[PDB]
Paper text:
Dye-decolorizing peroxidase (DyP), an enzyme involved in Mtb’s oxidative stress response, is encapsulated in a nanocompartment, encapsulin (Enc), and is important for Mtb’s survival in macrophages. Enc nanocompartments self-assemble to form a protein shell with icosahedral symmetry. The Enc protein is a homolog of a single subunit viral capsid protein and adopts a HK97 (bacteriophage Hong Kong 97)-like fold. DyP is a heme-containing enzyme that oxidizes and degrades a wide range of synthetic dyes and, importantly, reduces hydrogen peroxide (H2O2) to water. It has been shown that Mtb-DyP is a hexamer, where the C-terminus of Mtb-DyP contains the TP sequence that targets Mtb-DyP to the interior of the Mtb-Enc 60-mer shell.
The crystal structure of the Mtb-Enc•DyP complex was solved by MR to 3.15 Å resolution and refined to a final Rwork/Rfree of 20.2/23.3. Application of crystallographic symmetry generated an intact 60-subunit capsule with T1 icosahedral symmetry. While the compact domain of Mtb-DyP (residues 1-314 based on the AlphaFold Mtb-DyP predicted structure) lacks a corresponding electron density in the interior of the Mtb-Enc shell and cannot be modeled, the electron density for Mtb-DyP-TP was observed. In the ASU, nine DyP-TPs were modeled. These peptides were bound to the interior of subunits D, G, H, I, P, Q, R, S, and T, and are referred to as d, g, h, i, p, q, r, s, and t, respectively. In addition to the Mtb-DyP-TPs, the Mtb-Enc•DyP structure displayed excess electron density that we modeled with molecules from the purification and crystallization process: glycerol, nickel (Ni2+) ions, and PEG molecules. Notably, the crystal structure of Mtb-Enc•DyP described here has the smallest mycobacterial five-fold pore described to date at 3.6 A. In the crystal structure, the Cα of His187 is translated ~5–6 Å upwards, resulting in the orientation of its carbonyl oxygen directly into the pore, and Tyr189 is angled ~45–50° along the pore and translated such that the hydroxyl group is ~6–7 Å away from its cryo-EM position. Further, when investigating areas where small molecules from the purification buffer or crystallographic condition colocalize, we noted intriguing small pores formed at the interface of neighboring subunits along the five-fold symmetry axis, which will be referred to as five-fold minor pores, while the pore formed at the five-fold symmetry axis will be referred to as the five-fold major pore. The resulting pore has, on average, a bottleneck diameter of 3.4 ± 0.8 Å, with −1.8 ± 0.4 hydropathy and 26.6 ± 4.1 polarity.
Numbering used by the authors:
A (entry chain H), D (entry chain I): 1 to 267
B (entry chain i): 319 to 330
C (entry chain L): 1 to 265
E (entry chain h): 323 to 331
The structure:
């Protein structure tokens, strides 16, 4: 087996299929960074750091020697446990299609939110600076009148163009801002139709973030280094419940500061 | 000579 | 080597690749004239002038001889130096993707802006008049109300059609006017959709120019004669920095005065 | 070219051959750890860390997430500069075999000593614990009478055997202890002959260390992870001198504490 | 599916 120890879990093959399908589509619904950043191939469970190529001054061993430490970006392991009812698991083989996978969906929503928040807002505990913090472009404020959103997106796009940044530009909207853009109509004309003619890329539903982001999808600017992609592992079980978990080992790196424009509300 | 330059010491 | 002396620069092959990629795409993002003018093939480093075909009266050598000088537009060499940190250069081979190429991008933005302003606004020191100065069509004023921009574009287009000018018409907007067209909506209707339905060509982002231009892309009217296209050369270096440069040798010629309409504030 | 920029150095092809030969054989004479530890294949200039496989507890991003950082041992870049006379370099092509390569030999001796000291004594600035510090076996004192050296070596060997450690056992002696073992004779019988019958491996000349070490060469206990092996690079030059350097990027890891026995003089 | 897969666009 592997570190997941999936073979030791009292879960039917049929139940495994339902659990894996639900976790997969639920994670994809809440996730949005994996649609604009460069996601690498899984490097394996041995992957523990990403070389940043930079040198770090360190005390020399003796005189006449110049010593430097090799800088690297560490990987963080995210593990979201959840508990399932063994009755719901055993019901799958008996023909049940309404088994309670809500703990599975909540773990997928949580892991997806942690990942997108790590990419865009940051994760200081893992030395991961967010895109918003690294954005060298002037941040903008979302207007109070939603009919003025095309104005702020247009200025954000011009900031990217004035910084020498190319590539198909995409706009990531938070759950509240996305709903606002979908419903707002300036004199009946829907403002999302206005935005669709301004964005050569896509307008992405990003529920984990807050505010909005305007970035490029040319590639080579945002790097999601995967060591271990999302997987379902087994922890423990009794005669009534099974403790599983969603696990992922990754880190994020932002190579181009001017490749993004952050947007936020006002307090 | 005028290239890479790893003396290729390795395990002795 | 050549006059660039690239082989003498302490820059790794890996660093050269990223430096060239960054300079290339940054120059292409800020450039906007090569999308409406005719850019020729590079004539080589020997290219020094472009024949204008015209004759110039000059003093005869003796009686009975009619002497004329061959008029020609000279080429100008633009050279934008920049300095890179050797730590950032050496970091590339060690696996760094965040090396500081801002001096490369700033040199690209400067060289691109010099070229576009030379094409559209002129460069008198190089005998380059420019599209705006040579445009025989009546210049227009951009309106204060951005919702009236379709009015001024429609009149600019009508000026070209009334001058016998054909071809796909294109509109080049400055950074401020382009952002205004993208955001302005007349009663919710985006004015860019109105403009896109009036322009059979493209609406080009032209950050280096000021105002706007409406011209034809039929060909044969605006000629950017390249002797040497944009390249990266090596100047000098120490133990900490390398001084490189973006170089280009070109000239611009405007053959048709009525082929363009200039707009300003 | 690469980061060494060897092509920019005013050094003849003939001089490069002699300079590289001298650095190679000088480094090989003073080095003594690369003969008992596992030296890895060069991972390349991109290599910056070695996964230790362990997790480090870190603050969770939100509730319900268990976050751990992947541990990694960093690589250190050692660079020993030296200066050569351009007259000595240009003499090589003219047929000189007495060119002054002493700066090369001193840089090789310095880099070799730094490496063995890092392997056996440690390098705290680079988070590299020495073999002596990590040795869980009881350390021993070299006797005052050199004719009693076989006694302390025999007890060191028994310490390894009593710890379940197998493999060909080797003994690394410092410059002073090695010379004493070579010259000392107990009633005319050379004590080195006694030691050669006690060691199934080799008795290694280790001038960089002090004291002595008795360890196993079975493999998998001492790991010298090479990112870039020792190479000669170019820094700067004028009309009279050239500044070159020996560069190396590596780390050391000790996986088995009981696989070695350290010995020192009586303080 | 299988847990999840990157490169969703
Ligand atoms: Ni709003
Ligand atoms: Ni349990
Ligand atoms: Ni005449
Ligand atoms: Ni002339
Ligand atoms: Ni924790
Ligand atoms: Ni000879």
């Amino acid at each position: 087996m592997n570190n997941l120890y999936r073979d030791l879990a009292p879960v039917t093959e049929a139940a495994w299929a339902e659990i894996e399908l639900e976790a997969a589509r639920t994670f994809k619904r809440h996730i949005a960074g994996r649609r604009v950043v460069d996601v690498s191939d899984p490097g394996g469970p041995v992957t523990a750091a990403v070389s940043t190529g930079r040198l770090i001054d360190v005390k020399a061993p003796t005189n006449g020697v110049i010593a430097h430490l090799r800088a690297s970006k560490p990987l963080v392991r995210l593990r979201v446990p959840f508990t399932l009812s063994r009755n719901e698991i055993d019901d799958v083989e008996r023909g049940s299609k309404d088994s309670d996978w809500e703990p599975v969906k909540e773990a997928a929503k949580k892991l997806a939110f942690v990942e997108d928040r790590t990419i865009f807002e940051g994760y200081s505990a893992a030395s991961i600076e967010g895109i918003r913090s690294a954005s060298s472009n002037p941040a903008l404020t979302l207007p109070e009148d939603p009919r003025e959103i095309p104005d702020v997106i247009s200025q954000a796009l011009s900031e990217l163009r004035l910084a020498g940044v190319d590539g198909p530009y995409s706009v990531l909207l938070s759950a509240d801002v996305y709903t606002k853009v979908s419903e707002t109509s300036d004199h009946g004309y829907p403002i999302r139709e206005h935005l669709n003619r301004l964005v050569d890329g896509d307008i992405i539903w990003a529920p984990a973030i807050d505010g909005a982001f305007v970035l490029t999808t040319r590639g080579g600017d945002f790097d999601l280094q995967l060591g271990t992609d999302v997987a379902i592992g087994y922890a423990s079980h009794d005669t009534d419940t099974v403790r599983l978990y969603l696990q992922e080992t990754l880190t994020f790196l932002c190579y181009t500061a001017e490749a993004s424009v952050a947007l936020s509300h006002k307090l | 000579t005028l290239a890479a330059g790893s003396l290729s010491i390795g395990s002795l």
